[PDB]
Design a binder for these strands. Sequence first.
RNA 1: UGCACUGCGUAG
RNA 2: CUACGCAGUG
RNA 3: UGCACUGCGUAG
RNA 4: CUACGCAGUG
Lengths: 814, 814, 81, 81, 62, 62
Amino acid sequence: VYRAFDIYNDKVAGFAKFLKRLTKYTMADLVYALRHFDEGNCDTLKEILVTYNCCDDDYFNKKDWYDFVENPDILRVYANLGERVRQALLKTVQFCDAMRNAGIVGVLTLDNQDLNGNWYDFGDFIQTTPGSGVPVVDSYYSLLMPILTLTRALTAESHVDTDLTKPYIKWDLLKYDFTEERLKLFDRYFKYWDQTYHPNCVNCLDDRCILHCANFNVLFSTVFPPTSFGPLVRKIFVDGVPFVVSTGYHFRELGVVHNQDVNLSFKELLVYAADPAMHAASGNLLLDKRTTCFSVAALTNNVAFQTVKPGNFNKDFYDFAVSKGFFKEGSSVELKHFFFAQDGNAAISDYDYYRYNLPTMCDIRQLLFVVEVVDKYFDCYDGGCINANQVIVNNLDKSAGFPFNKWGKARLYYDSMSYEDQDALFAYTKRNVIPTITQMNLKYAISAKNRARTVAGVSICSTMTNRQFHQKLLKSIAATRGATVVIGTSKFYGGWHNMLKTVYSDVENPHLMGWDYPKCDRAMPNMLRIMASLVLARKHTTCCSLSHRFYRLANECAQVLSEMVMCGGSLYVKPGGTSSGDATTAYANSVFNICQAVTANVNALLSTDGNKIADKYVRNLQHRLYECLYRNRDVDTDFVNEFYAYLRKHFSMMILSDDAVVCFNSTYASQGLVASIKNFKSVLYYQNNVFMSEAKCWTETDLTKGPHEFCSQHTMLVKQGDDYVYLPYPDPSRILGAGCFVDDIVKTDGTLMIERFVSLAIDAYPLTKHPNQEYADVFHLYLQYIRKLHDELTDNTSRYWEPEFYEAMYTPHT
Amino acid sequence: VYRAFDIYNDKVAGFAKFLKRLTKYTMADLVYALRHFDEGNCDTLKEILVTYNCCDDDYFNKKDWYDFVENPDILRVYANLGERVRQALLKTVQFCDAMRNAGIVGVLTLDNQDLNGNWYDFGDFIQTTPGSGVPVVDSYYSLLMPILTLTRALTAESHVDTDLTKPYIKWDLLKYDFTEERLKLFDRYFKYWDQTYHPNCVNCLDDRCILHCANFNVLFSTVFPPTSFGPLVRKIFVDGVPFVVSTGYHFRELGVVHNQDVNLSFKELLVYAADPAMHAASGNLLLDKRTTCFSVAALTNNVAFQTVKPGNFNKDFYDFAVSKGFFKEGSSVELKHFFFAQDGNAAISDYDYYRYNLPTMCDIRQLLFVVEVVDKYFDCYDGGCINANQVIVNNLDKSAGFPFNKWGKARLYYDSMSYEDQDALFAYTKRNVIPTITQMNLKYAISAKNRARTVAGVSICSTMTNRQFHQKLLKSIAATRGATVVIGTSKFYGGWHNMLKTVYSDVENPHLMGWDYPKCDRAMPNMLRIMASLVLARKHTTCCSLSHRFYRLANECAQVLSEMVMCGGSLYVKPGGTSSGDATTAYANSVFNICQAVTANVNALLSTDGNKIADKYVRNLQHRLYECLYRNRDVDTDFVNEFYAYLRKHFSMMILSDDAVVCFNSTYASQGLVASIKNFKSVLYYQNNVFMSEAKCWTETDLTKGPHEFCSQHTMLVKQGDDYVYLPYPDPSRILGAGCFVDDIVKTDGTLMIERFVSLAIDAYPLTKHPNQEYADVFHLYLQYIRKLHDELTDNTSRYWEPEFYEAMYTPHT
Amino acid sequence: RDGCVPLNIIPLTTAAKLMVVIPDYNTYKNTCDGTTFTYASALWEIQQVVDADSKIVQLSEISMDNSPNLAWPLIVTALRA
Amino acid sequence: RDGCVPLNIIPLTTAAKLMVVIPDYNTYKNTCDGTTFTYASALWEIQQVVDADSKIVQLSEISMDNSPNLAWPLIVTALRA
Amino acid sequence: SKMSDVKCTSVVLLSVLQQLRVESSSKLWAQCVQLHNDILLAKDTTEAFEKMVSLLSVLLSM
Amino acid sequence: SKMSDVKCTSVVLLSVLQQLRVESSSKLWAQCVQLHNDILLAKDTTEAFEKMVSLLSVLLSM
RNA sequence: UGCACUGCGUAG
RNA sequence: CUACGCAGUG
RNA sequence: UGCACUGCGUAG
RNA sequence: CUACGCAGUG
Ligand SMILES: [Zn+2]
Ligand SMILES: [Zn+2]
Ligand SMILES: [Zn+2]
Ligand SMILES: [Zn+2]
């Protein structure tokens, strides 16, 4: 029968299942089960859980037991195993010591350690000078890293004498530096990890070192009390008056960071106001049982509850549609989009979803190789730092955030700060960390689901600094055509056809897939967000130094990753994830999507047997992938180039910030050479801590039909000017709901309706070529309603109700 | 095959079907078809109608074509034959003349005259002295009388020279006396009717003479213009000022009547005010196309529309019932009784139903015999005239009618008039006719049908005079137990059982029937109402003279039969029927019901073959019935007694004012010796001018079950004190609707609800013994609701919610 | 000759004002379509036309096109010519 | 020693007034059932209890029987003892 | 049951409409009365709901 | 169709309720919002009518 | 905002 | 028995 | 009452 | 090209 083995030799290499006192199952089996998870085949995981009293068989009778969102209690079950894992780690260290004492040089593999922690392998061990033994633990520890956080192995470290039974350790409330504790934990657990570990990322040599140190800090921080982390503040004298001002920050990932320009003007006033130190100091203590998140303070005497008003209904358009034969009984086209009202507890409830963000430790070698590969997808673009006068702001009448929203909009602050002041603030952010407060606001929009949606309005200072830092690269990405990232590419004037042709480019046996990210903005691991930030900042090689880039990363983390959240007059500490109001929201998520795809491909290739592979080139590629993953430190540029070319040839991706359309080779995916939907599910399981349902994922066998859905648009192949082209059309229900229901009564009727219905007709024209007659009739209904509105209002306006104007919008002339 | 024959001889007698150039059908066939009407067997009638171009065969494809209410157009079809009938009459007279010239003595039968009017019989004719021939036409004319009005034979008399083609006769608008025209019509049509005919009933020898003259006047009046009939008024000088006052009346039945105390005090003031002469003279001309009824004038500058408000809903009782398990899905007990709101045109629309009253001429010999038989049902009672101080008025706070309602209630006028004044008014009514105005008022009550209901409030003077005239007899009837009329007999304390036992008394093979009168109050022929009035007034042999009784009848006719109707500020002329606000409404209708039953029995007995009857006694009874019907003038008291005894033995009736429960012999009804449902249907067809549906009629085979329905109550046989008794229970829906819905919000809640629910529980207790469990649970729900109301309000009151109080109400102790 | 006259004919030959109730427009055209009409062998000229709500409906408004917008029945008041 | 303290702990050890949000009565009995309770190693005595509508809910009204009649969540404000 | 409470709701809606002086307008009162009477006599639940919705819309209009 | 117009009626009823300052009371607003959201997401016509009747009764109460 | 019958409840 | 109020029946 | 992309309409 | 407003997408 099949057991998981991590093998390396000339003939074959990889971590996969093979046909080949001691316990029935080994640690490699557990790692494989938790890293290659398929609900259809969970026999090994179920037997391991049952045998060691993690849970009972009845637990598996319940459906969706594996899902974290549907069944969070699973997190408890896995935790029941964590202690065992911890023990194994300790034993591993002992084993290593013995080898060092015995002058033994060898490689330790997960498949040679039983679940009781005992090591039963004495092969590949070569005698050397006593005291000179140097074991290799890269593969073992790297593969075991993801399991440690999922099972919460180090929980015992939070108890006195590292015993779960005995009480918790009562750390000093004022203590914030745990550097010695981090060194002690690393020495006890990862003693033989030869790579240097820096608890404080301020002393990291490069971006890869920062990722390594942050990965270790993620695991080490779970032990320390939550109150210790956060902004560090001091009481100082300014102008003969006392002020409490932030002078540092404690990051769960980056350790302790101290501002370089601490001392005891408009720039200073904004720095103080944006700082949550004063607000928290002047705020009353708060205990909110409505959420599991940390509560800091309350700035208001009374709590505030916000409600979502119901949508307005347009009787003229609904009556017109009814008279023309729509909304009948049994009709295919129906109203499924509405404005869903919410109670006063909705907003906070939405914040509660941040509970799905969990401390996740990534396979550091895998993450390093994946980031190196991902950097290739962003090589064409150019980036750097720009001055204040080179910054473009689309809208100056937007909210400036808290507390800046009280006094005015973003225009007020942009006008108040001169270019020199903005440059001074940016330079200050290159030397110091400025914590900020982000407000949570309910968004009023159409939806087909009753769930409320929240957006994070960040402070003005963070937006300004991130703009000056990133706008060059962001504009470079948006102006590029034919790349994997398709931000800035219009679907009109044949853009959809161009993108689809680009995706299909040179695939031997093409099929299409598309997947979804459950709770993407909330459940995203902090490590992946830091990796995306580093990828975006890697364009600053010349214009910024190592210290400047690190301080910019720290500012982003303190303003995006674990900032202070303002909700209904109360302050909370965001566990993690990504804010939707960031200057780099779309692009960071695109980087995350590319990283997940590359990780899935890497897992698929290594999980293959290798011996069965009948292609010499693919076997050599797998062997070199394992070499560059678990055996070689320095980045191999040649192999990175080769793997990027391989992925581009057999894995063509179109990514827009959450949505991915992938063209992949039939035979390679069937043989496991290329990632499939199951690989993405496993990756999202052991990395993103979320279960991906096959219902939300789609696979298209035939290219002529096109992608099932992309950006809420479906695709049709239609005949235009003797040439067949791909044309996007929306769901008729969405357009009809937009027409019938409106945000406010101001836009209920009048001239302003003409523009709205013209835009809706522009969007809905492609439905005319759909085989269904009602879909086509939707566009004619919209045109006739535009005619009727013009008549009620009463030559150029003719073009609005003549279909040639909408014909022109989808032709490749422009 | 079977043809209708009117036969008389020693062996057999009667008008029935027998197995026995010239036309296929004779006049006897038409008379039989129109007097014995069965929708199942209408072949002869259909063939007669089609052959003579009255209608086409397609007319019979339509269902309910025969029904007058559903298909009034049938009245037109029959009219197409009337002219033909008229011709026959003329020819008949000619034939008679010939016989008188030929010295021929014989009896003319309907079966010897073809539908072309030719007489082809020369048998039974015995030569005598020339010029001395005296034909017998009693049977012929008497049997043909009902057909004359239904077919409107005399319509040609309304045209110049008695020709339909030529224009109508333009009579002088001021002309009101048509005595000469009546004599001329009688001489031309009924020349050989030996009985004296008085166009003016003032000169009628007795009640039978009045009935005969009124029957002829009904036919003769259709020719004369409608405007001629009505009150006769004169302009006179009183106190040196001019007044228009009524001094006579023209009755379609009684001819011209002139007041005996015409001259040119409180009594005089009321006589003037009640008189419609002043109101009509001071009223503007009115033309109302909303109805086919005659429009007199409008007393108001603007027309008035009255609406019916919706019923109030009792949320406490409905919620209580719902909580206790009632009004569930699929439950047998459901809410089917409500207050139905009506628009402003409802009231007048209800008045439009008076269109169903038609001029009906009755078989005078049959009506005379039937009234003689009916008088036997009222022999036990005693009646007469009483003084003012002997009059009992239940409620003095009721409406006094128009115009008396303006100034006060009935109490005001009763107090104003002393006993001497009331006696003077009554004596005046014995010598003069006082026309009055009756108001139509919508009644607010529960119903299971959406139709609005109207009541006729008569003037105070008419009520007072009719009370003094009739109250003695009316109270005598209400105080009699064990009689056919069961007015005044309580259903409680075993009264229901006593009545049911009385009905079943001495019936050989008993079955039960019950029937309904469609549009009884509206479609009742005027002749039957006059007959009922005469029957009620026959108790005044000693206290009133012939003139006094005739003038009282004329006053009743001018105040009840064809009075002036006030509706929404407009005056109209009532075509006929009965008013519901009369002092004798219930008793007159009971007389009408008894008359209809006796007529049905007479028709059933005579319609039998006679030869097939194997009982000598029944054959002799039929022969003597024919003798006393169409051959003997003077009333045969012995035969009337014998027939009354026969009906009582084989036809036991329980009558309450519309509702009849009849116990009848099985074999006699099967053999045609006793009336069946079909006989009642035929009688209602050719007399009442309405079609009786078998759905509304019920027949019970077994006596133990009891009558299906009587006064809206069903019957159960239940065990009480070792004795089985008959117990009445209502429909649960009616009681539940009464409990849930109330007239006004004043009785919505409070102490007054206790009495209402106690009465409802008293009515609904019998449902406890019903086999259905929900029916019984209704009473317990009512009791529990009474308990809850008492609790909310908060020893003797215990009896209200204890079931012993309701037990006692249905036991024969009291 | 006798001095006695039926009551019903008194308003017919002596009423100066005539009120007609119109349930529908069909009876309207049949009976009193124009401003002047003939009834009871007399000529009546219309003075007012109100609706069921006691509002002054004008002659022009009465038509087949606008009949559904009228609160029937219509009360038309005219004077003897 | 260093003079640097975490921000989050400043309100914990220095806030004179404490506000607690109670979603349901179960958390009410668990956390601050009585007029005086213990939180953050400090004793807090209740001063006011308002509802979601900003109405002054009394201590007696808070109970299992009357819990359905309260506009949850309940905001309880107390002062440091 | 839904049919019975729908009938009760229709009755109370007609009562409040009458109290709103709706009867001043002849045609509106006629429509409301017809709808209410049909609701009471209705034997199909869907038609009763449709008529109740229509009458409630009549009330909401003013 | 009855389902679509029932949804529209529910939307407008919730709008008028919100304009009636119903949101001042927390529990009444919660009930109205839940009923409206269920009506919009409802797939059975009878349940939609029942919830619409309930919400209309809420409005009629005041 | 009608004519009768019946049965209840409160005062005498 | 009388006065008042209520409920049912035609 | 957030960060980006795209497309329209009105003035220059 | 710029200013304002609108619509769609994540
Ligand atoms: Zn480092
Ligand atoms: Zn830079
Ligand atoms: Zn006579
Ligand atoms: Zn007398």
